[PDB]
Amino acid sequence: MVPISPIETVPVKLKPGMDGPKVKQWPLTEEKIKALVEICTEMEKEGKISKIGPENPYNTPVFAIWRKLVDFRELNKRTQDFWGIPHPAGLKKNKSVTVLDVGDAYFSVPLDEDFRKYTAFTIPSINNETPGIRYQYNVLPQGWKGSPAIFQSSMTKILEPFAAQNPDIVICQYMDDLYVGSDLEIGQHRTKIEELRQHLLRWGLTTPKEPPFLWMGYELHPDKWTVQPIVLPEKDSWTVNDIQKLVGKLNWASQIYPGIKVRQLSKLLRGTKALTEVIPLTEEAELELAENREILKEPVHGVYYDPSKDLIAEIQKQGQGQWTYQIYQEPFKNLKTGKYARMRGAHTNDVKQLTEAVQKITTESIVIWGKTPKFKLPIQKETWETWWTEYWQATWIPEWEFVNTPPLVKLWYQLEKEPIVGAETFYVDGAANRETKLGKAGYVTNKGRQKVVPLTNTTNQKTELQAIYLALQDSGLEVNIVTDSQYALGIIQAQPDKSESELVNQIIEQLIKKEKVYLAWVPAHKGIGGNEQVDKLV
Amino acid sequence: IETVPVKLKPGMDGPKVKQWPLTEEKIKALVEICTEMEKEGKISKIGPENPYNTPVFAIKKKDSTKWRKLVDFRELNKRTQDFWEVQLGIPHPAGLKKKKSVTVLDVGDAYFSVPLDEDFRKYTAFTIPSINNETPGIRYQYNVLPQGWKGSPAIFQSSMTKILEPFKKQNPDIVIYQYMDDLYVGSDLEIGQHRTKIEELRQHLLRWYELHPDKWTVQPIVLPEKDSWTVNDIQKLVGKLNWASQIYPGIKVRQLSKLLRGTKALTEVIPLTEEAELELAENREILKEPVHGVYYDPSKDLIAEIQKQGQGQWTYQIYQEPFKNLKTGKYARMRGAHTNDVKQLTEAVQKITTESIVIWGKTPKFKLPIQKETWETWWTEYWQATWIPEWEFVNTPPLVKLWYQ
Numbered sequence: 024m025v026p027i028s029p030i031e032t033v034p035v036k037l038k039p040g041m042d043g044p045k046v047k048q049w050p051l052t053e054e055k056i057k058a059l060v061e062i063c064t065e066m067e068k069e070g071k072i073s074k075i076g077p078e079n080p081y082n083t084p085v086f087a088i089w090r091k092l093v094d095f096r097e098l099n100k101r102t103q104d105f106w107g108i109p110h111p112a113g114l115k116k117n118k119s120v121t122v123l124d125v126g127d128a129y130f131s132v133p134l135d136e137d138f139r140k141y142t143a144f145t146i147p148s149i150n151n152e153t154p155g156i157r158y159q160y161n162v163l164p165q166g167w168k169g170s171p172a173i174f175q176s177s178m179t180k181i182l183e184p185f186a187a188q189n190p191d192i193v194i195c196q197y198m199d200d201l202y203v204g205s206d207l208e209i210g211q212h213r214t215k216i217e218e219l220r221q222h223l224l225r226w227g228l229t230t231p232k233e234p235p236f237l238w239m240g241y242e243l244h245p246d247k248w249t250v251q252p253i254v255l256p257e258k259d260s261w262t263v264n265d266i267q268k269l270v271g272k273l274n275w276a277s278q279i280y281p282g283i284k285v286r287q288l289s290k291l292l293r294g295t296k297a298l299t300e301v302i303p304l305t306e307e308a309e310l311e312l313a314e315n316r317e318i319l320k321e322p323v324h325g326v327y328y329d330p331s332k333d334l335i336a337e338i339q340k341q342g343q344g345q346w347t348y349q350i351y352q353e354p355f356k357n358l359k360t361g362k363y364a365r366m367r368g369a370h371t372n373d374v375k376q377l378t379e380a381v382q383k384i385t386t387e388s389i390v391i392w393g394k395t396p397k398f399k400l401p402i403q404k405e406t407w408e409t410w411w412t413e414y415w416q417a418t419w420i421p422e423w424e425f426v427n428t429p430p431l432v433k434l435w436y437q438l439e440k441e442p443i444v445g446a447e448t449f450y451v452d453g454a455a456n457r458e459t460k461l462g463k464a465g466y467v468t469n470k471g472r473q474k475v476v477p478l479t480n481t482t483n484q485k486t487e488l489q490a491i492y493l494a495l496q497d498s499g500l501e502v503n504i505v506t507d508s509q510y511a512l513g514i515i516q517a518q519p520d521k522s523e524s525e526l527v528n529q530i531i532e533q534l535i536k537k538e539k540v541y542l543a544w545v546p547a548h549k550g551i552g553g554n555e556q557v558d559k560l561v
Numbered sequence: 562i563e564t565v566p567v568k569l570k571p572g573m574d575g576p577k578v579k580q581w582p583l584t585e586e587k588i589k590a591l592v593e594i595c596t597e598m599e600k601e602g603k604i605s606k607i608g609p610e611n612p613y614n615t616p617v618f619a620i621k622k623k624d625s626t627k628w629r630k631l632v633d634f635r636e637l638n639k640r641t642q643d644f645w646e647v648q649l650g651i652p653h654p655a656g657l658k659k660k661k662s663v664t665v666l667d668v669g670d671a672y673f674s675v676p677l678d679e680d681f682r683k684y685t686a687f688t689i690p691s692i693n694n695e696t697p698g699i700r701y702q703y704n705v706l707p708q709g710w711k712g713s714p715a716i717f718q719s720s721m722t723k724i725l726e727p728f729k730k731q732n733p734d735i736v737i738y739q740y741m742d743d744l745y746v747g748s749d750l751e752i753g754q755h756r757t758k759i760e761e762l763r764q765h766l767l768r769w770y771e772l773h774p775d776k777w778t779v780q781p782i783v784l785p786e787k788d789s790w791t792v793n794d795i796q797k798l799v800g801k802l803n804w805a806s807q808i809y810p811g812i813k814v815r816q817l818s819k820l821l822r823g824t825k826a827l828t829e830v831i832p833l834t835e836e837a838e839l840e841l842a843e844n845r846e847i848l849k850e851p852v853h854g855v856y857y858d859p860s861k862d863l864i865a866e867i868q869k870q871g872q873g874q875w876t877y878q879i880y881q882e883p884f885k886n887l888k889t890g891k892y893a894r895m896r897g898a899h900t901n902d903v904k905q906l907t908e909a910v911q912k913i914t915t916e917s918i919v920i921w922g923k924t925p926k927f928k929l930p931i932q933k934e935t936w937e938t939w940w941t942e943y944w945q946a947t948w949i950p951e952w953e954f955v956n957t958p959p960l961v962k963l964w965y966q
């Protein structure tokens with residue numbers, strides 16, 4: 024007998040204050056009992072378990088389905104704490120790729136000897152006229168909390184020297200499986216696979232699928248990768264679970280298929296809290312999902328990653344706060360794709376959303392390829408220049424070039440730094456009674472132009488925005504506006520190009536029509552001339 | 562040579578913190594560095610039985626192309642038991658901020674000669690991540706004292722005292738303070754003599770950054786001096802004054818506002834009256850005095866607010882309670898930062914933090930004028946500092962920006 028190299032066990036404890044699990048054994052049928060006795064007998068003959076006596080007060084329940092099922096749940100609660108998927112687009116193309124998944128994995132690795140007493144279980148004998156049979160695990164149990172970590176740590180430990188001796192091959196380690204790529208000749212590669220599985224045999228690990236590989240919802244082919252076909256459910260009743268499943272599936276399909284839109288469907292899920300509720304769809308949503316099934320009509324594949332070439336990310340604006348991106352190396356061949364939905368906010372602009380998207384793509388890239396991609400962005404250099412130079416917040420985008428593929432991101436209005444000479448000066452104000460919700464909004468100017476508009480169902484902030492809006496409506500191409508509102512100025516200083524407040528949007532369009540606008544602020548009730556609290560407060 | 566027992570605060574467990582993505586070159590640098598550190602016994606590989614994790618990345622210090630390992634110990638530092646020693650809570654050397662010159666040195670090479678308490682080692686665990694999760698991340702734990710931990714200089718205080726004992730007695734006019742892995746040394750000497758004394762001190766360290774606190778500024782609030790005032794000018798003046806009235810009690814804007822009465826064009830020139838000029842003068846005199854009853858409380862948090870003024874200029878305020886400022890200042894510094902806002906912000910945060918360490922002996926909590934995602938994405942690339950301050954993000958533009966310009 025050639026001695027198998029010993030696997031050194033991992034020291035394991037329980038959570039402090041908690042003792043081992045003690046749980047009664049449920050009544051089983053006679054067939055179950057017999058099958059369990061047979062299985063435990065042969066397992067004991069294999070040396071994966073050992074019989075124990077009365078000295079072990081800890082009892083973990085068991086079942087039979089023949090296959091034994093041990094329930095470690097309570098033990099999983101009382102066991103201590105231990106320490107994402109690889110993305111195909113990040114995989115670098117190799118001539119030969121071998122997949123080896125070790126059979127009978129957890130049982131190949133022993134258990135902490137001082138731990139083994141806790142896991143021990145009991146087989147009920149017939150009629151309960153005899154003391155039940157007692158067994159304990161000598162190895163890592165299937166269903167235990169700490170099995171995978173210990174297993175993979177041991178696996179790594181064993182694998183370490185082989186990769187060092189064979190730098191010309193690359194090994195990926197996911198969970199129970201190993202994936203060995205090489206650019207060598209297939210005979211060489213095969214022989215080195217033999218060497219590796221022998222190396223695993225020395226420590227007593229049993230090892231054995233060919234392309235394409237079905238892995239983690241993907242499909243892996245030698246020169247290209249894709250996703251396993253998505254099942255799109257159809258029905259006359261769309262439930263909440265239908266929406267969650269469709270959102271997850273479409274999100275999963277969005278990494279490769281360009282142009283996937285989950286917006287409407289995600290809108291349908293607001294505050295639902297219902298296992299069963301149906302919901303109708305808007306025409307925009309139906310056109311959306313129809314164009315989704317249209318995108319899913321003729322499938323496309325992603326390619327692999329070549330380190331010797333530039334990595335490029337191109338972004339397009341899909342509208343309605345939606346963005347889409349493609350990450351690729353050579354034209355027309357994508358490594359992968361994706362989408363970005365805007366965060367929930369009252370106001371916002373295209374430049375900000377574009378920036379956020381860039382940050383996201385950057386992080387995803389650093390995860391997958393370990394570097395930041397070059398960007399092609401639908402924004403002029405001058406636009407970005409003006410934006411980041413005049414923005415009140417610090418902001419940055421990594422290296423990028425302008426691609427012209429409309430719609431283009433632009434700045435729709437720019438406020439003057441200094442008061443405008445020759446431009447009329449509108450002093451505006453608004454106010455409302457918190458009780459009656461009645462208010463007034465208006466302006467007075469230096470040319471004697473005045474307006475006061477009475478308003479129903481409003482608030483101070485609304486009347487101040489309204490006042491600025493009135494100033495914008497009645498004034499020429501160039502205007503100076505003076506406001507006492509820190510709120511209105513707070514909104515306009517953030518430079519939204521779109522808002523969920525219609526008044527703000529009307530203000531925005533008004534600004535867009537303007538040649539020059541200077542917005543100035545003064546403290547209210549300080550008796551600043553031109554600032555009239557009296558017109559609006561009657 | 563002998564490990565002093567260290568534990569956590571009662572009720573708190575070891576830090577478990579997600580490791581963030583790292584670039585390929587940084588990962589390589591960390592791999593090489595840690596492979597070297599393992600041979601020297603500074604760290605050792607660990608198994609799955611150690612659930613604790615602390616973030617780690619790589620940087621480049623000033624005037625060096627050599628990568629340095631940087632661990633983010635913030636969570637561990639706050640979870641580390643508050644360290645009081647036989648030092649009896651050493652009072653900060655207030656003579657440091659009064660010095661003509663202060664040189665910052667990196668003493669972190671010393672911490673690696675001191676072993677760490679065994680039971681505590683499991684809390685120092687960190688993970689070098691792999692690209693695309695192709696292989697499990699390499700996990701280590703610290704056998705010796707790690708840099709960046711607040712307990713390391715605390716433990717090394719005695720040793721550092723015994724080492725720096727001769728230098729302090731030779732020339733008592735030189736002030737010495739230690740924070741984290743960095744050692745600040747003050748002097749009134751000439752820059753050349755200063756540098757030679759620094760060589761003497763570092764070679765004194767061998768056998769066992771230039772700052773100017775006197776040139777540091779505490780900024781007052783200034784008002785314009787004009788022969789001609791427009792409506793816009795006076796309105797801005799009244800705004801700034803009304804703002805300052807929160808800080809300074811006796812400010813009165815009424816006679817200035819009296820000039821604006823009626824509706825006038827913003828560009829129209831308004832001549833001042835005697836009452837107005839007098840009021841502006843009194844306001845100036847009120848502003849030339851310091852703030853009433855401003856004190857520092859060690860039992861309170863320091864807060865640093867930063868505003869972006871544009872053209873590479875930034876302003877800042879360090880304070881405890883609102884409208885009571887312990888310090889204010891401005892950073893115009895331009896080195897290779899022209900086209901990058903975030904790099905400027907990072908260097909600004911570093912400077913402000915350093916100054917804070919000099920003055921109060923502790924880092925402040927920043928409120929940054931930047932989005933969380935942008936900052937979190939780009940900050941480690943520009944970061945040369947061995948300590949990491951806490952921060953939050955202000956998403957609403959302050960109206961107080963041009964008031965500090």
Ligand SMILES: N#C/C=C/c1cc(Cl)cc(Oc2ccccc2OCCn2ccc(=O)[nH]c2=O)c1
Nearest residue numbers: 109114115116117120195202203204236238245
């Ligand atoms: N089931 C299953 C298999 C899953 C699997 C998972 C990972 Cl993380 C990697 C993997 O293959 C590789 C292993 C080692 C190096 C490179 C590899 O891939 C490089 C790209 N590639 C993919 C398939 C192919 O045939 N040729 C090819 O070049 C395979």
